[PDB]
Amino acid sequence: PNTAEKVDPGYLFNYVAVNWAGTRTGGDFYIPLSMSSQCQVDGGLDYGGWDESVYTISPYSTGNTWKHYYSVGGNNLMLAIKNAEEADPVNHNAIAQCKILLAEHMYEATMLWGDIPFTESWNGTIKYPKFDSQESVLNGVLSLLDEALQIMDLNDANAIDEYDIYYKGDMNKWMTLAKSLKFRTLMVMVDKDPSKATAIGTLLQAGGMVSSASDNLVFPYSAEPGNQNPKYELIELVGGTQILFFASNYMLKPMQERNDPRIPCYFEPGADGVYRGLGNREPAVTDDKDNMLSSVVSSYLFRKDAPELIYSCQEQLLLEAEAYARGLGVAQNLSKANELYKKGIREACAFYGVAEADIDTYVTGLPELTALTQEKALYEIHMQQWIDLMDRPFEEFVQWRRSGTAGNEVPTLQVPEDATSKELIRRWEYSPEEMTANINAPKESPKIWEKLWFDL
Amino acid sequence: AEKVDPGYLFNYVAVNWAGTRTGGDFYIPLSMSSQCQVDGGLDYGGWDESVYTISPYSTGNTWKHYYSVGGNNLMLAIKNAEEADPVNHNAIAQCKILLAEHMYEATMLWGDIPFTESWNGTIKYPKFDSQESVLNGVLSLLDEALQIMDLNDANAIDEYDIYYKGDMNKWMTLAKSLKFRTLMVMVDKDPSKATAIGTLLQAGGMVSSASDNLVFPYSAEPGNQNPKYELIELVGGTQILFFASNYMLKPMQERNDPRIPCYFEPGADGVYRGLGNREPAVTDDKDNMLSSVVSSYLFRKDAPELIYSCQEQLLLEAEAYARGLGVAQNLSKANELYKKGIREACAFYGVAEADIDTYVTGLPELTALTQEKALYEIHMQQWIDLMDRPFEEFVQWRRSGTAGNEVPTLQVPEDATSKELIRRWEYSPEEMTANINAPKESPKIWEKLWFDL
Ligand SMILES: [Cl-]
Ligand code: NA
Ligand code: NA
């Protein structure tokens, strides 16, 4: 923490950004979350055959991911903040930028592990930091974001700019993002802490939150060697043919019932031109000539320059729609909900490259939320959220758990047949290094089916 | 996993292997635990590995490299080369040499490990082979490589061979040298290897000049920078994490070794001075560094990662002649090779020719020493050569002596739990959990491996 000397905040910020994206798109994160959440499937043991399909998350995967949030990301964001505080002139915007990423790092960590270190982390005086409750951590996330919004200065050109790969130092975009991450985090907490409804309402009244694609928080991979999306390498190592990630029936069937024009963007068809999916661990279907008849996840999503989307306007717009449908700090309003639902679906389809005319057709044909019961309207919003997040398995897993209380999650999932667990997965076990080295860690890790605080 | 280019896989392995060897989860554990370097105390480096606390992530990441990243893909590359038309015999040789070297490195950390049953679809949970099996397996792979290799076939891994660009004469020279090195590792525990060592010495054609070195060339190009540079950039670009160990510096000073300025930076007063394990780095009242840090030049972006060197080879040859391993004991020959190896060592680190001459001139002739004292000086030169190559250093230190006569003599770190010097690593968490044929308990870090007496 204080062992390092003078380090440029921008260098550190970008190092964190690159490794964070590398982590989110890596095999020790993307695969566990996609296969365990069942938003994708592995095509059985002959193909993907991922242990994570039956809830076996490797201790290397938890350790590598944990190492990123605490050593690679957290430690260096804190260091960047310290250098920005100590600079002359004080770089207020750099502090805001770094605090927003730090907030998002701790948010992601607690949504996997629940109770985790935070308040005592990155402290030279504390050898072995205590574990904070998820409730503490999530309120800590909100505080960081509010601290960022307070210290930020839109009339100061000084910021992390050349080393800000997200927004190039445009503090209006960081402001817009910080508010949106607040809103998202509040939506995560509001089932367990209903008193958050008020703060949600206040943000909805204020506006100025992520609303179009230019506002997206996205890490841009490129074709340049050295900045290629790790997902490409994953497929190159098995010959360049995408035979590891398959269309899950939990994803494809709802899309087919709604005639969703994203199907060709999310999946490749079978050899006959037909899109067809698979259950968890169901063997991929081939003909006698060994042609693939099952749908695989689109190879386009595993290309070298595939972007890594961290927070999107679709995501925001469908959450706003949900808030109005549920009347969270605002009067229940299915008219406004419908407007935002339609808008979110348009931005979703646009992001994945659906043609304008096909978007129009899809959105036109979808029932107005106005014409449904509040219960059915909310179900359709939740389903659209589930559809939106197939290629964003971390957000998907949060979304699925958040979507319902007392077994009413959308969509309804079955426990994988060959899993030890009798119940659906709800969290990750703690990393081996933290369990060994930290004397203030739990002696025992909670089981993977034990709900986290936010999850009812 | 279907049709894949062997060259693509080979290069992917090479890059990640170098990335692993120069990474903080390998270089730091080995340098700090072996005590060929020190951390300057808790205010500076403050590395847990100084007190033998090797993280379960570090063992897991390293293990993952040898088995998943390296081994699995080398096997896959070999399979694709076997199935190609025409059969790419040289690619197979190239891949087998690297695979041998991967298993060699793994057994020298963990002892008994999977090998014969690894990378097999029919075997869920592979058994652990004895180190003896693995090391003989390493020799077999190298011999298989030398046999299948074809010097009249232009076809090989060339554009994707970052080491030698497909020059199979260099791979031949290397394979023989790795055999020799591996035999030297085994000969204390298995003295019958002396004969095979003798045979290789008679034949020659082993690594002898810098162009023969197996080295991964990092560059200034973003995307191929040495991880050690990033490590120092993250703490401000000033090298305050790796410090001169007294176990390294003092022997160099008593011999007036001209590598001192290449290995270290002097203190602010121009004096080179070292530190004990975990000893706090010394500063003046003005906060200038008076202790010697490891040279920042060694942490530059294009610092090469040396995997097998001609110094290393030449000092081992010198040792073999000094000990009479399959050849008649011969301190004249040993002296010739010792002098030669020291010259190549100093040259590698950029010592000026005149200063090399002075140093080698001033060193006693092995001829004029007892065989015991001559061997001690060879061992000390080997220890000096490997400061910035901590994996090889740790092998070297353990191999250097039997029954507590290692060179140099080391003390156990004060704040370590262990009562004895470190000898191995504990097994990775994933392998202990997932493999039902793994040991229930990991051996303790002070329990000698098979080769180590
Ligand atoms: Cl900048
Ligand atoms: Na829930
Ligand atoms: Na020994």
PDB file of N, CA and C in Angstrom, chain B residues 17-38 47 49-50 54 58-59 61-62 66 105 109 218 226-229 231-232 239 241-244 248 262-264 293-300 303-306 349 385-394 425:
ATOM      1  N   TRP B  17       5.374 -20.226 -20.808  1.00  0.00           N
ATOM      2  CA  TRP B  17       6.457 -20.768 -19.999  1.00  0.00           C
ATOM      3  C   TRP B  17       7.396 -19.657 -19.539  1.00  0.00           C
ATOM      4  N   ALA B  18       7.854 -18.827 -20.471  1.00  0.00           N
ATOM      5  CA  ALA B  18       8.692 -17.674 -20.117  1.00  0.00           C
ATOM      6  C   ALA B  18       7.948 -16.727 -19.178  1.00  0.00           C
ATOM      7  N   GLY B  19       6.674 -16.475 -19.480  1.00  0.00           N
ATOM      8  CA  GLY B  19       5.827 -15.634 -18.633  1.00  0.00           C
ATOM      9  C   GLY B  19       5.694 -16.181 -17.224  1.00  0.00           C
ATOM     10  N   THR B  20       5.668 -17.509 -17.102  1.00  0.00           N
ATOM     11  CA  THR B  20       5.602 -18.178 -15.805  1.00  0.00           C
ATOM     12  C   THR B  20       6.934 -18.052 -15.063  1.00  0.00           C
ATOM     13  N   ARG B  21       8.037 -18.384 -15.732  1.00  0.00           N
ATOM     14  CA  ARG B  21       9.365 -18.327 -15.110  1.00  0.00           C
ATOM     15  C   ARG B  21       9.783 -16.925 -14.640  1.00  0.00           C
ATOM     16  N   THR B  22       9.315 -15.885 -15.322  1.00  0.00           N
ATOM     17  CA  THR B  22       9.667 -14.509 -14.963  1.00  0.00           C
ATOM     18  C   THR B  22       8.595 -13.845 -14.112  1.00  0.00           C
ATOM     19  N   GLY B  23       7.505 -14.567 -13.850  1.00  0.00           N
ATOM     20  CA  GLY B  23       6.371 -14.020 -13.114  1.00  0.00           C
ATOM     21  C   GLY B  23       6.574 -14.012 -11.613  1.00  0.00           C
ATOM     22  N   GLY B  24       5.748 -13.227 -10.931  1.00  0.00           N
ATOM     23  CA  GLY B  24       5.846 -13.060  -9.490  1.00  0.00           C
ATOM     24  C   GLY B  24       5.464 -14.288  -8.686  1.00  0.00           C
ATOM     25  N   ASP B  25       4.753 -15.226  -9.304  1.00  0.00           N
ATOM     26  CA  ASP B  25       4.363 -16.472  -8.639  1.00  0.00           C
ATOM     27  C   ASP B  25       5.381 -17.607  -8.819  1.00  0.00           C
ATOM     28  N   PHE B  26       6.570 -17.285  -9.323  1.00  0.00           N
ATOM     29  CA  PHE B  26       7.627 -18.279  -9.562  1.00  0.00           C
ATOM     30  C   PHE B  26       8.989 -17.689  -9.175  1.00  0.00           C
ATOM     31  N   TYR B  27       9.346 -16.580  -9.811  1.00  0.00           N
ATOM     32  CA  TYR B  27      10.630 -15.915  -9.592  1.00  0.00           C
ATOM     33  C   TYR B  27      10.811 -15.496  -8.141  1.00  0.00           C
ATOM     34  N   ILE B  28       9.768 -14.910  -7.562  1.00  0.00           N
ATOM     35  CA  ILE B  28       9.831 -14.413  -6.189  1.00  0.00           C
ATOM     36  C   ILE B  28       9.914 -15.550  -5.153  1.00  0.00           C
ATOM     37  N   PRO B  29       9.003 -16.541  -5.216  1.00  0.00           N
ATOM     38  CA  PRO B  29       9.141 -17.689  -4.315  1.00  0.00           C
ATOM     39  C   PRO B  29      10.527 -18.323  -4.322  1.00  0.00           C
ATOM     40  N   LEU B  30      11.079 -18.563  -5.503  1.00  0.00           N
ATOM     41  CA  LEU B  30      12.355 -19.255  -5.606  1.00  0.00           C
ATOM     42  C   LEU B  30      13.538 -18.388  -5.166  1.00  0.00           C
ATOM     43  N   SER B  31      13.557 -17.116  -5.554  1.00  0.00           N
ATOM     44  CA  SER B  31      14.678 -16.236  -5.193  1.00  0.00           C
ATOM     45  C   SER B  31      14.721 -15.957  -3.685  1.00  0.00           C
ATOM     46  N   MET B  32      13.565 -15.666  -3.098  1.00  0.00           N
ATOM     47  CA  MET B  32      13.484 -15.315  -1.679  1.00  0.00           C
ATOM     48  C   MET B  32      13.609 -16.522  -0.773  1.00  0.00           C
ATOM     49  N   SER B  33      13.027 -17.661  -1.163  1.00  0.00           N
ATOM     50  CA  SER B  33      13.111 -18.883  -0.345  1.00  0.00           C
ATOM     51  C   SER B  33      14.492 -19.535  -0.441  1.00  0.00           C
ATOM     52  N   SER B  34      15.121 -19.482  -1.615  1.00  0.00           N
ATOM     53  CA  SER B  34      16.488 -20.002  -1.776  1.00  0.00           C
ATOM     54  C   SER B  34      17.523 -19.095  -1.118  1.00  0.00           C
ATOM     55  N   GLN B  35      17.158 -17.826  -0.924  1.00  0.00           N
ATOM     56  CA  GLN B  35      18.012 -16.803  -0.291  1.00  0.00           C
ATOM     57  C   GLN B  35      19.195 -16.353  -1.157  1.00  0.00           C
ATOM     58  N   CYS B  36      19.110 -16.597  -2.465  1.00  0.00           N
ATOM     59  CA  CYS B  36      20.063 -16.021  -3.417  1.00  0.00           C
ATOM     60  C   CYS B  36      19.788 -14.529  -3.596  1.00  0.00           C
ATOM     61  N   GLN B  37      18.600 -14.105  -3.166  1.00  0.00           N
ATOM     62  CA  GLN B  37      18.266 -12.686  -2.999  1.00  0.00           C
ATOM     63  C   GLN B  37      17.517 -12.495  -1.676  1.00  0.00           C
ATOM     64  N   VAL B  38      17.348 -11.241  -1.255  1.00  0.00           N
ATOM     65  CA  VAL B  38      16.554 -10.919  -0.057  1.00  0.00           C
ATOM     66  C   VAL B  38      15.604  -9.756  -0.326  1.00  0.00           C
ATOM     67  N   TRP B  47       8.443  -9.900   1.277  1.00  0.00           N
ATOM     68  CA  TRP B  47       7.846 -11.030   0.589  1.00  0.00           C
ATOM     69  C   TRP B  47       7.644 -12.154   1.579  1.00  0.00           C
ATOM     70  N   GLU B  49       7.519 -15.136   1.002  1.00  0.00           N
ATOM     71  CA  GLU B  49       8.334 -16.260   0.582  1.00  0.00           C
ATOM     72  C   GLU B  49       9.730 -16.238   1.222  1.00  0.00           C
ATOM     73  N   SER B  50      10.132 -15.086   1.758  1.00  0.00           N
ATOM     74  CA  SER B  50      11.379 -14.978   2.523  1.00  0.00           C
ATOM     75  C   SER B  50      11.374 -15.859   3.772  1.00  0.00           C
ATOM     76  N   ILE B  54       5.038 -20.087   0.802  1.00  0.00           N
ATOM     77  CA  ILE B  54       4.726 -20.126  -0.623  1.00  0.00           C
ATOM     78  C   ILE B  54       3.209 -20.246  -0.760  1.00  0.00           C
ATOM     79  N   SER B  58       0.455 -19.677  -5.995  1.00  0.00           N
ATOM     80  CA  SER B  58       1.730 -19.769  -6.705  1.00  0.00           C
ATOM     81  C   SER B  58       2.040 -21.204  -7.125  1.00  0.00           C
ATOM     82  N   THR B  59       1.786 -22.161  -6.236  1.00  0.00           N
ATOM     83  CA  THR B  59       1.972 -23.570  -6.565  1.00  0.00           C
ATOM     84  C   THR B  59       0.953 -24.008  -7.614  1.00  0.00           C
ATOM     85  N   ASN B  61      -0.738 -22.023  -9.847  1.00  0.00           N
ATOM     86  CA  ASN B  61      -0.501 -21.363 -11.120  1.00  0.00           C
ATOM     87  C   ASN B  61       0.643 -22.036 -11.858  1.00  0.00           C
ATOM     88  N   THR B  62       1.705 -22.347 -11.122  1.00  0.00           N
ATOM     89  CA  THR B  62       2.883 -22.989 -11.685  1.00  0.00           C
ATOM     90  C   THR B  62       2.551 -24.407 -12.158  1.00  0.00           C
ATOM     91  N   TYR B  66       2.606 -26.246 -16.062  1.00  0.00           N
ATOM     92  CA  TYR B  66       3.316 -27.443 -16.508  1.00  0.00           C
ATOM     93  C   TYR B  66       2.355 -28.488 -17.078  1.00  0.00           C
ATOM     94  N   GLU B 105      11.297 -29.569 -14.753  1.00  0.00           N
ATOM     95  CA  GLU B 105      11.087 -28.456 -13.835  1.00  0.00           C
ATOM     96  C   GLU B 105      10.064 -28.816 -12.762  1.00  0.00           C
ATOM     97  N   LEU B 109      10.554 -29.326  -8.331  1.00  0.00           N
ATOM     98  CA  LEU B 109       9.838 -28.578  -7.305  1.00  0.00           C
ATOM     99  C   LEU B 109       9.044 -29.516  -6.383  1.00  0.00           C
ATOM    100  N   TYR B 218      12.502 -11.591 -24.776  1.00  0.00           N
ATOM    101  CA  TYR B 218      11.573 -10.495 -24.588  1.00  0.00           C
ATOM    102  C   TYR B 218      12.086  -9.293 -25.368  1.00  0.00           C
ATOM    103  N   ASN B 226       9.141  -8.291 -20.762  1.00  0.00           N
ATOM    104  CA  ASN B 226       9.427  -9.174 -19.648  1.00  0.00           C
ATOM    105  C   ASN B 226       8.577  -8.766 -18.446  1.00  0.00           C
ATOM    106  N   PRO B 227       7.787  -9.703 -17.894  1.00  0.00           N
ATOM    107  CA  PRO B 227       6.958  -9.449 -16.705  1.00  0.00           C
ATOM    108  C   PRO B 227       7.675  -8.777 -15.533  1.00  0.00           C
ATOM    109  N   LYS B 228       8.972  -9.032 -15.381  1.00  0.00           N
ATOM    110  CA  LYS B 228       9.779  -8.373 -14.352  1.00  0.00           C
ATOM    111  C   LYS B 228       9.770  -6.842 -14.463  1.00  0.00           C
ATOM    112  N   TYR B 229       9.688  -6.315 -15.680  1.00  0.00           N
ATOM    113  CA  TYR B 229       9.595  -4.871 -15.881  1.00  0.00           C
ATOM    114  C   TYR B 229       8.299  -4.319 -15.297  1.00  0.00           C
ATOM    115  N   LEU B 231       6.459  -5.564 -13.003  1.00  0.00           N
ATOM    116  CA  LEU B 231       6.552  -5.685 -11.557  1.00  0.00           C
ATOM    117  C   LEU B 231       7.126  -4.426 -10.907  1.00  0.00           C
ATOM    118  N   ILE B 232       8.201  -3.898 -11.489  1.00  0.00           N
ATOM    119  CA  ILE B 232       8.856  -2.689 -10.991  1.00  0.00           C
ATOM    120  C   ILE B 232       8.098  -1.418 -11.398  1.00  0.00           C
ATOM    121  N   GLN B 239      13.620   0.246  -8.448  1.00  0.00           N
ATOM    122  CA  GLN B 239      13.799  -1.136  -8.028  1.00  0.00           C
ATOM    123  C   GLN B 239      14.122  -1.198  -6.533  1.00  0.00           C
ATOM    124  N   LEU B 241      12.404  -3.709  -4.466  1.00  0.00           N
ATOM    125  CA  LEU B 241      11.746  -4.937  -4.037  1.00  0.00           C
ATOM    126  C   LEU B 241      12.697  -6.120  -3.910  1.00  0.00           C
ATOM    127  N   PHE B 242      13.828  -6.075  -4.616  1.00  0.00           N
ATOM    128  CA  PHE B 242      14.787  -7.187  -4.664  1.00  0.00           C
ATOM    129  C   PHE B 242      16.174  -6.700  -4.266  1.00  0.00           C
ATOM    130  N   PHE B 243      16.727  -7.268  -3.198  1.00  0.00           N
ATOM    131  CA  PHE B 243      17.961  -6.744  -2.604  1.00  0.00           C
ATOM    132  C   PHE B 243      19.105  -7.741  -2.629  1.00  0.00           C
ATOM    133  N   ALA B 244      20.321  -7.207  -2.625  1.00  0.00           N
ATOM    134  CA  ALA B 244      21.526  -8.030  -2.583  1.00  0.00           C
ATOM    135  C   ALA B 244      21.588  -8.863  -1.303  1.00  0.00           C
ATOM    136  N   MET B 248      25.193 -14.054  -1.463  1.00  0.00           N
ATOM    137  CA  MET B 248      25.606 -13.868  -2.863  1.00  0.00           C
ATOM    138  C   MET B 248      26.716 -12.859  -2.976  1.00  0.00           C
ATOM    139  N   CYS B 262      27.125  -5.483 -12.350  1.00  0.00           N
ATOM    140  CA  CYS B 262      26.084  -5.959 -13.267  1.00  0.00           C
ATOM    141  C   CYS B 262      24.894  -6.552 -12.518  1.00  0.00           C
ATOM    142  N   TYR B 263      25.171  -7.220 -11.401  1.00  0.00           N
ATOM    143  CA  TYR B 263      24.139  -7.847 -10.579  1.00  0.00           C
ATOM    144  C   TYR B 263      23.441  -6.839  -9.682  1.00  0.00           C
ATOM    145  N   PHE B 264      24.193  -5.853  -9.195  1.00  0.00           N
ATOM    146  CA  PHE B 264      23.688  -4.925  -8.190  1.00  0.00           C
ATOM    147  C   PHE B 264      23.915  -3.461  -8.540  1.00  0.00           C
ATOM    148  N   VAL B 293      20.602  -2.835  -4.122  1.00  0.00           N
ATOM    149  CA  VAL B 293      19.459  -3.512  -4.713  1.00  0.00           C
ATOM    150  C   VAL B 293      19.941  -4.289  -5.926  1.00  0.00           C
ATOM    151  N   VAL B 294      19.160  -5.285  -6.335  1.00  0.00           N
ATOM    152  CA  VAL B 294      19.453  -6.034  -7.539  1.00  0.00           C
ATOM    153  C   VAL B 294      19.339  -5.050  -8.697  1.00  0.00           C
ATOM    154  N   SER B 295      20.263  -5.144  -9.647  1.00  0.00           N
ATOM    155  CA  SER B 295      20.353  -4.164 -10.734  1.00  0.00           C
ATOM    156  C   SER B 295      19.032  -3.992 -11.480  1.00  0.00           C
ATOM    157  N   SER B 296      18.632  -2.742 -11.692  1.00  0.00           N
ATOM    158  CA  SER B 296      17.384  -2.446 -12.392  1.00  0.00           C
ATOM    159  C   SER B 296      17.488  -2.879 -13.860  1.00  0.00           C
ATOM    160  N   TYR B 297      18.709  -2.933 -14.386  1.00  0.00           N
ATOM    161  CA  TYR B 297      18.963  -3.440 -15.740  1.00  0.00           C
ATOM    162  C   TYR B 297      18.406  -4.845 -15.951  1.00  0.00           C
ATOM    163  N   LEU B 298      18.451  -5.666 -14.903  1.00  0.00           N
ATOM    164  CA  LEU B 298      17.925  -7.035 -14.974  1.00  0.00           C
ATOM    165  C   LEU B 298      16.400  -7.094 -14.982  1.00  0.00           C
ATOM    166  N   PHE B 299      15.753  -5.965 -14.703  1.00  0.00           N
ATOM    167  CA  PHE B 299      14.295  -5.868 -14.718  1.00  0.00           C
ATOM    168  C   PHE B 299      13.797  -5.018 -15.887  1.00  0.00           C
ATOM    169  N   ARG B 300      14.647  -4.805 -16.890  1.00  0.00           N
ATOM    170  CA  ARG B 300      14.261  -4.020 -18.058  1.00  0.00           C
ATOM    171  C   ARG B 300      13.296  -4.795 -18.957  1.00  0.00           C
ATOM    172  N   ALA B 303      14.700  -7.679 -21.048  1.00  0.00           N
ATOM    173  CA  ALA B 303      15.604  -8.603 -20.385  1.00  0.00           C
ATOM    174  C   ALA B 303      15.264 -10.007 -20.857  1.00  0.00           C
ATOM    175  N   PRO B 304      16.267 -10.757 -21.330  1.00  0.00           N
ATOM    176  CA  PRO B 304      15.999 -12.093 -21.839  1.00  0.00           C
ATOM    177  C   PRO B 304      15.780 -13.061 -20.694  1.00  0.00           C
ATOM    178  N   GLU B 305      15.016 -14.127 -20.946  1.00  0.00           N
ATOM    179  CA  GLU B 305      14.838 -15.200 -19.978  1.00  0.00           C
ATOM    180  C   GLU B 305      15.682 -16.390 -20.400  1.00  0.00           C
ATOM    181  N   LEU B 306      16.779 -16.580 -19.681  1.00  0.00           N
ATOM    182  CA  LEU B 306      17.766 -17.599 -19.994  1.00  0.00           C
ATOM    183  C   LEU B 306      17.327 -18.923 -19.374  1.00  0.00           C
ATOM    184  N   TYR B 349      26.608 -11.108 -18.876  1.00  0.00           N
ATOM    185  CA  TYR B 349      26.137  -9.979 -18.071  1.00  0.00           C
ATOM    186  C   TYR B 349      26.837  -8.647 -18.408  1.00  0.00           C
ATOM    187  N   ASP B 385      26.661 -17.705 -10.687  1.00  0.00           N
ATOM    188  CA  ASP B 385      26.097 -17.593 -12.033  1.00  0.00           C
ATOM    189  C   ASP B 385      24.569 -17.505 -12.043  1.00  0.00           C
ATOM    190  N   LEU B 386      23.908 -18.100 -11.056  1.00  0.00           N
ATOM    191  CA  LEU B 386      22.460 -18.301 -11.138  1.00  0.00           C
ATOM    192  C   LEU B 386      21.585 -17.375 -10.270  1.00  0.00           C
ATOM    193  N   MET B 387      22.133 -16.259  -9.795  1.00  0.00           N
ATOM    194  CA  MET B 387      21.370 -15.328  -8.948  1.00  0.00           C
ATOM    195  C   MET B 387      20.066 -14.895  -9.578  1.00  0.00           C
ATOM    196  N   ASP B 388      20.112 -14.522 -10.853  1.00  0.00           N
ATOM    197  CA  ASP B 388      18.929 -14.054 -11.577  1.00  0.00           C
ATOM    198  C   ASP B 388      18.156 -15.194 -12.255  1.00  0.00           C
ATOM    199  N   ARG B 389      18.505 -16.437 -11.932  1.00  0.00           N
ATOM    200  CA  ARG B 389      17.823 -17.619 -12.464  1.00  0.00           C
ATOM    201  C   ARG B 389      17.470 -18.524 -11.287  1.00  0.00           C
ATOM    202  N   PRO B 390      16.509 -18.083 -10.466  1.00  0.00           N
ATOM    203  CA  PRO B 390      16.310 -18.679  -9.154  1.00  0.00           C
ATOM    204  C   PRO B 390      15.852 -20.137  -9.170  1.00  0.00           C
ATOM    205  N   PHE B 391      15.151 -20.569 -10.216  1.00  0.00           N
ATOM    206  CA  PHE B 391      14.810 -21.984 -10.321  1.00  0.00           C
ATOM    207  C   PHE B 391      16.068 -22.851 -10.427  1.00  0.00           C
ATOM    208  N   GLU B 392      16.959 -22.482 -11.345  1.00  0.00           N
ATOM    209  CA  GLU B 392      18.215 -23.199 -11.529  1.00  0.00           C
ATOM    210  C   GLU B 392      19.078 -23.074 -10.279  1.00  0.00           C
ATOM    211  N   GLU B 393      19.025 -21.914  -9.637  1.00  0.00           N
ATOM    212  CA  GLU B 393      19.771 -21.685  -8.412  1.00  0.00           C
ATOM    213  C   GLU B 393      19.363 -22.660  -7.321  1.00  0.00           C
ATOM    214  N   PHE B 394      18.058 -22.856  -7.167  1.00  0.00           N
ATOM    215  CA  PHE B 394      17.528 -23.720  -6.118  1.00  0.00           C
ATOM    216  C   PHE B 394      17.903 -25.181  -6.379  1.00  0.00           C
ATOM    217  N   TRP B 425       8.482 -27.743  -2.754  1.00  0.00           N
ATOM    218  CA  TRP B 425       7.207 -27.053  -2.627  1.00  0.00           C
ATOM    219  C   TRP B 425       6.115 -28.042  -2.241  1.00  0.00           C
TER     220      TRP B 425
END
